[PDB]
């Protein structure tokens, strides 16, 4: 499955995975630390 | 290695300990004396801690012994861990000051001997006085050997010195530990162990203390 993992390394798939990751990280940060208007913690 | 004595018969000793130092039984399981410079330092450190610990265990026991026998000192019955609170002609302040000045002198002399052997074998004032040439660091001799030893017997005596000194260092470690755990004097600990040795082990006392 060298070719399949080459496909997963393509720009659109890697972009989808990375932005799902970034968006999920931000979403979980905003779930556990809701409404962060200022850096106070 | 060789057929020398060993702290563990049959154990493959490290090798850099080859009998040239007194009390060489190959015991270096941490390999602290692997480098010969560190070994040259640790030999003198062992000698010094040993001799001071021998003096210390003497000056802790024979006062305890002379007090339990029933002789009269002003400083009798005062524990070795309480002799600092004792009152003397001078406060401990001045005593430490004088002690540290005098020990600066003599310990820097000893250190000059260790750095450059054969250098501190002469007086500042009375140059007619000197220590005999050919001595080693840790074994000055001369006025430090007035009763006339060191003619023969010297390896036997160095082995004896370092054995008694290791025993005394262990004894002082034991004085500290026993006075911190039992809170009493060491010979009274001996007496409480000889009263009933089977109910006064360290295991027993430490289990009862928790």
């Amino acid at each position: 499955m060298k070719d399949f993992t080459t496909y997963l390394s393509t720009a659109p798939v890697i972009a989808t995975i990375w932005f799902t990751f970034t968006a999920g990280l931000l979403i979980e940060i905003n779930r556990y630390f809701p409404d962060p208007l200022v850096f106070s913690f | 290695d060789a057929a020398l004595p060993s702290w563990m018969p049959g154990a493959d000793l490290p090798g850099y300990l080859n009998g040239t130092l007194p009390g060489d039984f190959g015991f270096d399981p941490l390999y602290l004396g692997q480098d010969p410079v560190k070994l040259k330092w640790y030999a003198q450190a062992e000698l010094m801690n040993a001799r001071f610990a021998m003096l210390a265990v003497a000056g802790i026991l024979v006062p305890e012994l002379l007090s339990n026998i029933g002789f009269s000192w002003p400083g009798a019955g005062v524990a070795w861990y309480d002799a600092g609170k004792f009152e003397y002609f001078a406060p401990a302040s001045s005593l430490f000051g004088v002690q540290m000045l005098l020990f600066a002198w003599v310990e820097i002399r000893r250190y000059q001997d260790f750095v450059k052997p054969g250098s501190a074998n002469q007086d500042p004032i009375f140059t007619n006085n000197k220590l005999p040439d050919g001595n080693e660091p840790g074994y000055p001799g001369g006025i430090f050997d007035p009763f006339g030893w060191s003619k023969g017997d010297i390896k036997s005596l160095k082995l004896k010195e370092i054995k008694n000194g290791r025993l005394a260092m262990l004894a002082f470690a034991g004085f500290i530990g026993q006075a911190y755990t039992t809170g009493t004097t060491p010979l009274k600990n001996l007496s409480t162990h000889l009263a009933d040795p089977w109910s006064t082990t360290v295991w027993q006392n430490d289990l009862a203390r928790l």
Binding site: - | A90, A92, S93, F96, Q112, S119
Partner: protein
């Protein structure tokens, strides 16, 4: 080469034997460079002469009864009317401060324009004791040794006063009254815990 400062320690190679006061004491190797060493040789004798005068004065002001060296300048503050041997002097702090600036500026500028001069025979050797001879070398050694002793003694003045608050002679009397209850170890300053 007069002395060793550490019996057994062989002397540094940058300290010449012809130097008055050479015991081979340069463990920091400050005088390894010859120009540095020349400046230091002049500054040592200067510090030492000034310290000899200073210790002589701090001892004479107290042995004669006019207080200690530390309390002498408290006429400028705490009032006025400077005194000398009991004779009050008609100079306030500003006048003598300015005259000292002027006079010492003239003197030390005349000394600095001379380059490195530490033994200026002539107007400073009227009684003719040093002509670069055996006696001159011996006397230079005596001068530098008394100067080193006086520097140590003035450092002792300062430290003993900062620790005790007494004068030199007052502290000496305290020590002679109780050599073991009155020393550097018995004040709560020099040794940290006691």
């Amino acid at each position: 080469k007069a002395g060793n400062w550490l019996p057994g320690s062989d002397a540094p190679a940058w300290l010449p034997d012809d130097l008055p006061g050479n015991y081979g004491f340069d463990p920091l190797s400050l005088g390894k460079e010859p120009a540095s060493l020349k400046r230091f040789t002049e500054s040592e004798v200067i510090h030492g002469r000034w310290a000899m005068l200073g210790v002589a004065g701090s001892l004479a002001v107290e042995l004669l009864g006019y207080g200690n060296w530390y309390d002498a300048p408290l006429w400028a503050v705490n009032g006025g009317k400077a005194t000398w041997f009991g004779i009050e002097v008609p100079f306030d702090l500003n006048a003598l401060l300015a005259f000292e600036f002027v006079a010492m500026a003239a003197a030390e500028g005349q000394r600095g324009d001379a380059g490195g001069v530490v033994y200026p025979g002539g107007a400073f050797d009227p009684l003719g004791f040093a002509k670069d001879s055996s006696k001159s070398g011996e006397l230079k050694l005596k001068e530098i040794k008394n100067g080193r002793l006086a520097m140590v003694a003035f450092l002792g003045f300062v430290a003993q006063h900062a620790a005790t608050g007494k004068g030199p002679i007052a502290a000496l009397g305290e020590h002679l009254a109780n050599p073991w209850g009155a020393n550097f170890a018995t004040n709560g300053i020099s040794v940290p815990f006691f």
